[PDB]
Amino acid sequence: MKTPLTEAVSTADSQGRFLSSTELQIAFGRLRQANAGLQAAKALTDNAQSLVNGAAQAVYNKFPYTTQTQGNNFAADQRGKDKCARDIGYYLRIVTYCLVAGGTGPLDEYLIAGIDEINRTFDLSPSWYVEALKYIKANHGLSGDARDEANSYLDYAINALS
Amino acid sequence: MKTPLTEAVSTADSQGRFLSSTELQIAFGRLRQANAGLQAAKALTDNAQSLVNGAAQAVYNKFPYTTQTQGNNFAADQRGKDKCARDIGYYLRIVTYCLVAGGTGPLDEYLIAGIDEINRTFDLSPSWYVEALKYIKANHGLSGDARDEANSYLDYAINALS
Amino acid sequence: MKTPLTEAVSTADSQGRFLSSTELQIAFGRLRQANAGLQAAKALTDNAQSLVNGAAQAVYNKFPYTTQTQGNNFAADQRGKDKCARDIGYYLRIVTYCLVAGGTGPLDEYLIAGIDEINRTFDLSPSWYVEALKYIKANHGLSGDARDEANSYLDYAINALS
Amino acid sequence: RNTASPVYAGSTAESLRGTSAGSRNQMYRLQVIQGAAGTRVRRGKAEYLVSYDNLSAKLQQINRQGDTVTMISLA
Amino acid sequence: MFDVFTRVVSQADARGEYLSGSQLDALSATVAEGNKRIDSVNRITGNASAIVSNAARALFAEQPQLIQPGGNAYTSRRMAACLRDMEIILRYVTYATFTGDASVLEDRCLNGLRETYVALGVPGASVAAGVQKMKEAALDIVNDPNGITRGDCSAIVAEIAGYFDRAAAAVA
Amino acid sequence: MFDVFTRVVSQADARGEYLSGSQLDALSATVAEGNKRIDSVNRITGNASAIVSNAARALFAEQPQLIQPGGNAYTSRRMAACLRDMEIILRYVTYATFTGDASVLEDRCLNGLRETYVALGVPGASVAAGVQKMKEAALDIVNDPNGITRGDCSAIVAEIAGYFDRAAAAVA
Amino acid sequence: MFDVFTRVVSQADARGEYLSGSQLDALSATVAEGNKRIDSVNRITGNASAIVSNAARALFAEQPQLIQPGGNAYTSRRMAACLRDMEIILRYVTYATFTGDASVLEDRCLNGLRETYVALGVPGASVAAGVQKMKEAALDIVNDPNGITRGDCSAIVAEIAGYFDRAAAAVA
Amino acid sequence: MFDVFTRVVSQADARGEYLSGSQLDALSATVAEGNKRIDSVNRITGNASAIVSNAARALFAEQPQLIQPGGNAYTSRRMAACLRDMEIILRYVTYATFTGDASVLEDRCLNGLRETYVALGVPGASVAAGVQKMKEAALDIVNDPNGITRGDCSAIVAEIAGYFDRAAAAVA
Amino acid sequence: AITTAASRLGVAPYNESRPVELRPDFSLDDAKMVIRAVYRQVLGNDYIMDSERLKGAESLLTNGSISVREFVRTVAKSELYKKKFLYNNFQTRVIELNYKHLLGRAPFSEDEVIFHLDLYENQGFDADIDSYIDSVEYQENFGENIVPYYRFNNQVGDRTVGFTRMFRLYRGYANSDRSQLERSSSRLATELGQNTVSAIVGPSGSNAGWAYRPSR
Ligand SMILES: *[C@@H](C)[C@H]1/C(=C/c2[nH]c(/C=C3N=C(/C=C4\NC(=O)C(CC)=C4C)C(C)=C\3CCC(=O)O)c(CCC(=O)O)c2C)NC(=O)[C@@H]1C
Ligand SMILES: *[C@@H](C)[C@H]1/C(=C/c2[nH]c(/C=C3N=C(/C=C4\NC(=O)C(CC)=C4C)C(C)=C\3CCC(=O)O)c(CCC(=O)O)c2C)NC(=O)[C@@H]1C
Ligand SMILES: *[C@@H](C)[C@H]1/C(=C/c2[nH]c(/C=C3N=C(/C=C4\NC(=O)C(CC)=C4C)C(C)=C\3CCC(=O)O)c(CCC(=O)O)c2C)NC(=O)[C@@H]1C
Ligand SMILES: *[C@H](C)[C@H]1/C(=C/c2[nH]c(/C=C3N=C(/C=C4\NC(=O)C(CC)=C4C)C(C)=C\3CCC(=O)O)c(CCC(=O)O)c2C)NC(=O)[C@@H]1C
Ligand SMILES: *[C@H](C)[C@H]1/C(=C/c2[nH]c(/C=C3N=C(/C=C4\NC(=O)C(CC)=C4C)C(C)=C\3CCC(=O)O)c(CCC(=O)O)c2C)NC(=O)[C@@H]1C
Ligand SMILES: *[C@H](C)[C@H]1/C(=C/c2[nH]c(/C=C3N=C(/C=C4\NC(=O)C(CC)=C4C)C(C)=C\3CCC(=O)O)c(CCC(=O)O)c2C)NC(=O)[C@@H]1C
Ligand SMILES: *[C@H](C)[C@H]1/C(=C/c2[nH]c(/C=C3N=C(/C=C4\NC(=O)C(CC)=C4C)C(C)=C\3CCC(=O)O)c(CCC(=O)O)c2C)NC(=O)[C@@H]1C
Ligand SMILES: *[C@H](C)[C@H]1/C(=C/c2[nH]c(/C=C3N=C(/C=C4\NC(=O)C(CC)=C4C)C(C)=C\3CCC(=O)O)c(CCC(=O)O)c2C)NC(=O)[C@@H]1C
Ligand SMILES: *[C@H](C)[C@H]1/C(=C/c2[nH]c(/C=C3N=C(/C=C4\NC(=O)C(CC)=C4C)C(C)=C\3CCC(=O)O)c(CCC(=O)O)c2C)NC(=O)[C@@H]1C
Ligand SMILES: *[C@H](C)[C@H]1/C(=C/c2[nH]c(/C=C3N=C(/C=C4\NC(=O)C(CC)=C4C)C(C)=C\3CCC(=O)O)c(CCC(=O)O)c2C)NC(=O)[C@@H]1C
Ligand SMILES: *[C@H](C)[C@H]1/C(=C/c2[nH]c(/C=C3N=C(/C=C4\NC(=O)C(CC)=C4C)C(C)=C\3CCC(=O)O)c(CCC(=O)O)c2C)NC(=O)[C@@H]1C
Ligand SMILES: *[C@H](C)[C@H]1/C(=C/c2[nH]c(/C=C3N=C(/C=C4\NC(=O)C(CC)=C4C)C(C)=C\3CCC(=O)O)c(CCC(=O)O)c2C)NC(=O)[C@@H]1C
Ligand SMILES: *[C@H](C)[C@H]1/C(=C/c2[nH]c(/C=C3N=C(/C=C4\NC(=O)C(CC)=C4C)C(C)=C\3CCC(=O)O)c(CCC(=O)O)c2C)NC(=O)[C@@H]1C
């Protein structure tokens, strides 16, 4: 999956080469980033319940028909509400993995690949999840490099949905 | 060329992806290195004639037959000595390019690719150039990251010749 | 374009073969069907405006937020309503082409190929058009072979959207 | 033979590279006259776009088949 | 490729228009000619080998320079390629007759063919003469009134003759 | 392809010269701008979908002929291709911004693009208008003072503008 | 392949859990060792040719039966393959050190190597002897206190020794 | 791949026999049921998306272990692959209904499928349950008395049930 | 050919298929069939997600900017291919997969492993991929404009060991190279080294003993 260390070795392996100063520079870039990523992962994890619940409610407010309309794809009943909070939790959890790994790899492998087919098949609007991701962006309270990297994955997911 | 920035974009383009946090971290790694690399290039450039002349004499000292044996491939005459000093200058100049570019790309593109055919065709011993590179390593007077990056390229050339 | 005559020749051409009894039977199948398709196309064409306006109102009735919510992707203004009526008109018109052609080729080439990217890019919900297509099925008034073929294309579009 | 040839003057020689143009990101357009002396030949005149890395291999391929090279230019 | 139906559809889509009643009526008339169309395809196909071989023999009889040593049809490989070309052209003419549209013949067979022949020294005018001989035999086979429901196939025969004429014009 | 560093190297190698002190100093200045460059790449990428979609909507609003039946952006496939092209050009512009050199954009994306569009009948002037719309949106996003360490980004914004202008000129 | 970070991530996802505080702290500890890890990779790579050649020369000296006529390393082709294999194993050892995870070494290098050597008659025990020789040379190079910031590299050295041990065990 | 007609032909050829009068009459009865067969194929195809999605929803509701973290249908990629599998099996079942012979299912859909699921760890028993759910929905759709010329479709329905049972048995 | 055992061996669907050729002045549907055929063949019938598609390469193929062979080369050099088949495999397994994907046959001899292992180690993966596609064998079978396909039937230049080893690499129609019982292990490392073959075991579904695999 796409992370700086994996990409570096993947490039050298493709070329049949030992690692060179180029790959070492990649590792230095990872080390400069890693601690901020781990801090962001911890902050999101400690706040996960609040972010997921607030994110779900933000979606319901923006799309009130989702809590008023009968259907398996909507959150009018507790069943659909539980499914919705589960899904938003998956986004938040996998985003923390990206922060730990230092790349979109976890999002690419676990969430984004095939997401279009899932949303089409089960009649789920990508706009719902875009709204949830925007809520998490505006409410995770991170700053500095932690904010920048975290928002990059949240926007990466948003762009994949749009 | 093989440099962190071009390689990062090349791999992203192969996947049709926008650049992500992984590639941004590659850039940060490059930025951490570049000033030391540029300083290393300046120091080698300012000392180039001393290093090149010293390296050529070191080869002649270690391989005295090169200055005493008649032949197109040897340095018994001024013609061969000039060819030799020119070649050692090429190694040093292209090594400074690697420091500027932050990768082995200039060495690969300009010198290393095809060096075996040249050395075989013109009966030039790789051991001669290994000794010259060893001299430059031992006499460039760099320290810290400048030393580490410069020696990585000098070792890269030595390994290619062995 | 997938139609019985084009696929018969293309398969024969891929085999480097003259047409044989197999392909002639394909032609007879088309001839058994063709008049029903043409009459179905005529009936839908004559009733096009009533079907399109009725379909659009069916969508607005089923998804009232589309006519209440501001946004470029919604029909809260005449701009959005005109876009929506236009889109539903495209679905109906291209369906009549399928009846004329005797296959889904017109739908595949003009409408379905790339529709997922468009709806994702412009935040258009496939469920809206599914509802529009369902209204057309329920109200075109066809019978017999004309009904069966027309509904196959309308269901083909619905399946493509789901 | 009272025939014409395609016009590849100015920028009309250019072709898209993308990620398919090899290490140098350069495309070479080989116009050849070919016949069936293997896969079926569909046209007596053909054009091939190959990267620099594969240009040598392509020439031997054309050479092995006995086909004639009429023009080569950068694309 | 297009068939007789998709050709009308493509033009209508580019104008953003439903097919008019007249256009639908014209296609209904095409449907009414379907059995005659299918019979014509079947009759040419059933006689394809005779059509090609008889035309080739007649062609080489009238143009002995093709098969004399050094001639473009001399040697087994070139003769075989020549007979193949005749069979190819006849095949795509039947394709066009089957679909009711010349696009398959033009796109897959005739486009580039004159350039191929000029490039390789194939005499296109001789190819055209061979196509004309195939045209004559094929139309006679189609028009044979024996063993078939009697009716007027002049429109279909005219259409088939046009495809042969385009093939003859394309190579010459 | 070149980056900002290897561009100077290649010019120096062809002359057989070490980089001058002025050239090294210029690269040192480029390194000092690296964080601004990374932020600009991140900001454009983080808004890629909105930039493409908003510009595409504005283009079709100002050029309704593109989307009318028969228009070059009519039908789902052609619209999907058009939106894909806008994203591709944006992606390669961000590549050039990342490397600091137009080679990746020129060598991989723009070379031969005009001929592709001329052959297809894609209106190049409309593509350039689309690229222009993406440019103004992208530069505003890059220039947004909120949520970022404040400083002067005029140099990188000018560089990004040049890359967009190159793309518009290549296709117009 | 996995790196040190993605190995923990993949395990966490299968359990559907956020990384625990201890897990994040453990990875933070790994980050603090990153400079030493990079230096160890750089030092092995910079001496790769000497490590392989010196190990190979030592191996053939203790095991002259490898290079006698008919021996498994006899003939230029087989000797070149032998030197190549030593370089391959060293290369993937440095990869695993770089990533902090043995997966790349297992997946690319060691998975199937024993089956290959057994099928061909390559003495796996002698390969393992060569790998051990590269190990002693490589660890000595990593531990050299000259020309580097002083500190404790025992943990990194132990990990590298483990990868060499894994390579030797895979073939012996 | 055989159809209902070529299945009998292949058995006859292996015996070197003409089809008997009984065999020809049996095929005549198959032709008499052809309209029912085409209708059943059309009805299943026209509801394919609903059959897949409804069956998938029911399977995951009764087997929540499939979709929890670590489950074989967890993550979008595995989930999408799972939905593709259901659609593919349904698609081939319609092929078998169309041809009147199970060979297309055996030759293509179920050929190597058990190896695929064992290798990947896909729970074959759960696939069988999903196939059973699609079967229940499909047969109801085929049997719907509304909007169709009334008649007895028990024979075709029994045949379709068998193809579903074949697929379910092949995986578990 | 293969007639009686075709269905049993999983060959019948390929008996019923024809080579996918991109003719000059190809239509839109022609290009789509090539892209589908290339993805199924070169990526070993693995499911391809929309996010994994090589949209740029598909565009150039559709435009005539790259031929079928160059499209095949682009797919084979992509990160998608390397992720699926390079980064997690022994190079002998990689060589096996390359032969099946790009040449539609199994390796014949240890010499092929020697050639491609050295070529990868000395020049890299991209250089090795070029060797398959620019080979005389690729030229004679597929040329510029035909998608690679499995060569089950006997051809000039064949060896009998190739036939038996095809069913070591091909495990049925409803199957992918990454979803077989041996998983990542090289199928032919032992067979090539000892110049031995094994009794053909047909795919599951049509063969009860489909799962037989020998031990170490
Ligand atoms: C065991 C491996 C030996 C050892 C290592 C060690 N290194 C550091 C610190 C640094 N090493 C580097 C490395 C590089 N700088 C470059 O520019 C490049 C070339 C691309 C490399 C490889 C760096 C950047 C640092 C940090 C800054 C510094 O100059 O110190 C340490 C100190 C602790 C730390 O983790 O930073 C150590 C211990 N030291 C030994 O004594 C072992 C023989
Ligand atoms: C069990 C399957 C159900 C059922 C079927 C049934 N159908 C017919 C007759 C016909 N059905 C068709 C079908 C089509 N006509 C078209 O143009 C197309 C679209 C391409 C289709 C699918 C046709 C042509 C006929 C014949 C004419 C007619 O309309 O009747 C029957 C009657 C018996 C017969 O075989 O002809 C039956 C029984 N009927 C049921 O009650 C089941 C729910
Ligand atoms: C000009 C082409 C000649 C001609 C043709 C002609 N044919 C018909 C009618 C039919 N021909 C067929 C054909 C076939 N039935 C089969 O089973 C096969 C094998 C696949 C074939 C080729 C059919 C089905 C018909 C309809 C029934 C019938 O036999 O009449 C006509 C009559 C008009 C019509 O369009 O049906 C005609 C005119 N007749 C000539 O005199 C020309 C020499
Ligand atoms: C919340 C914003 C809205 C909502 C949600 C909702 N989702 C489903 C069903 C599914 N959700 C997913 C998504 C994922 N599965 C994964 O494994 C991952 C990646 C790790 C993701 C993102 C899937 C695959 C499904 C289908 C299978 C399942 O049910 O688990 C439903 C139910 C749909 C149905 O028809 O059963 C709902 C309700 N709905 C709303 O209205 C909210 C605004
Ligand atoms: C330019 C258009 C705008 C602007 C940019 C700007 N940025 C900085 C400084 C930093 N920006 C970063 C960026 C990141 N940190 C991360 O971890 C990541 C995610 C992977 C990114 C993208 C960093 C590391 C710095 C340095 C630390 C700092 O915050 O100061 C500056 C300040 C000067 C500098 O170049 O460092 C500026 C000017 N500022 C504007 O006002 C423009 C709108
Ligand atoms: C109607 C059910 C709902 C609705 C419609 C709506 N659509 C758009 C914009 C577009 N619609 C299409 C669709 C097509 N274009 C084609 O060429 C074809 C194939 C022949 C189709 C089906 C496209 C491509 C667009 C985008 C470009 C364009 O504007 O034409 C809009 C506007 C979206 C925007 O952001 O401008 C709207 C409003 N919206 C509803 O709320 C209805 C329920
Ligand atoms: C002689 C043993 C018997 C015989 C011969 C016969 N041959 C033809 C016609 C042709 N013969 C050839 C052969 C070749 N043409 C070449 O260029 C070469 C290779 C250098 C060869 C071997 C060909 C191609 C033809 C057909 C075209 C042509 O006429 O030139 C005929 C006439 C056949 C016809 O239908 O006109 C005959 C009579 N016939 C016998 O009965 C002899 C026992
Ligand atoms: C016969 C009446 C005349 C004749 C023919 C002749 N043609 C060729 C060579 C070619 N003919 C074609 C044409 C096609 N190939 C196709 O695949 C299709 C489309 C499906 C067509 C229309 C081509 C492409 C060639 C060249 C490649 C090939 O030979 O297969 C030859 C041989 C030329 C040579 O010297 O090799 C000949 C002899 N020649 C005559 O003299 C007759 C007038
Ligand atoms: C959108 C603003 C405008 C528009 C675009 C449009 N483009 C095409 C077709 C192609 N576009 C490309 C371009 C690229 N492909 C690549 O891989 C890259 C990077 C190297 C680029 C820049 C290509 C190659 C094609 C042709 C093949 C393909 O279809 O993908 C179309 C379709 C043309 C047609 O008739 O099929 C369209 C619509 N059209 C407008 O009207 C806008 C102004
Ligand atoms: C003699 C002209 C000069 C010389 C020779 C020398 N050679 C080696 C070591 C090796 N020689 C070979 C060569 C071959 N091995 C083969 O199997 C074949 C093909 C059948 C050949 C040609 C090899 C492979 C080696 C290395 C392994 C081994 O020792 O067997 C040495 C020792 C090198 C070392 O580092 O041990 C020497 C001394 N040396 C001179 O000075 C002469 C001018
Ligand atoms: C050297 C210390 C010992 C030795 C080695 C030796 N190996 C071979 C042959 C092969 N080696 C490999 C290895 C790899 N392939 C891979 O994919 C990987 C990871 C990337 C590895 C490590 C393979 C597959 C072969 C077979 C192909 C080839 O011959 O290159 C030989 C040649 C054996 C023969 O030719 O029969 C040799 C000599 N031999 C010794 O005696 C040393 C102990
Ligand atoms: C869904 C109900 C269940 C499920 C399914 C599942 N399947 C796979 C992977 C594959 N499925 C197939 C099957 C086919 N491919 C074909 O081409 C054909 C028709 C000829 C068939 C029947 C194949 C070959 C694969 C592997 C290829 C690939 O790319 O996946 C997966 C993915 C497993 C993984 O690890 O990715 C899944 C999830 N899983 C469940 O839990 C349900 C019971
Ligand atoms: C004839 C005396 C007997 C006989 C033969 C028979 N063989 C096959 C099929 C194949 N034969 C081979 C053998 C080879 N292929 C090679 O490349 C070589 C070495 C260069 C050999 C020896 C192969 C591989 C096949 C299968 C592939 C193919 O045929 O192309 C058949 C047909 C089998 C079938 O159709 O299923 C037959 C009939 N059969 C007898 O009964 C005779 C005793």
Author numbering:
A (entry chain W), B (entry chain O), C (entry chain Q): 1 to 162
D (entry chain c): 196 to 232, 236 to 273
E (entry chain R), F (entry chain P), G (entry chain X), H (entry chain V): 1 to 172
I (entry chain b): 2 to 217
Text from the published report:
Here, we take advantage of the latest cryo-EM developments to determine the structure of the quenched PBS bound to OCP to a resolution of 2.1 Å in the core and 1.8 Å in the rods, with some regions reaching 1.6-Å resolution. High-resolution details were readily visible in several parts of the map, for example, in the rods, where characteristic holes in the density of aromatic residues became apparent. Therefore, to explore to which extent resolution detail can be improved, we took advantage of the local D3 symmetry within the central Cpc(αβ)6 double hexamer of the rod (“central rod disk”) to improve the signal-to-noise ratio. The same particles yielded a resolution of 1.8 Å when not applying any symmetry (C1).
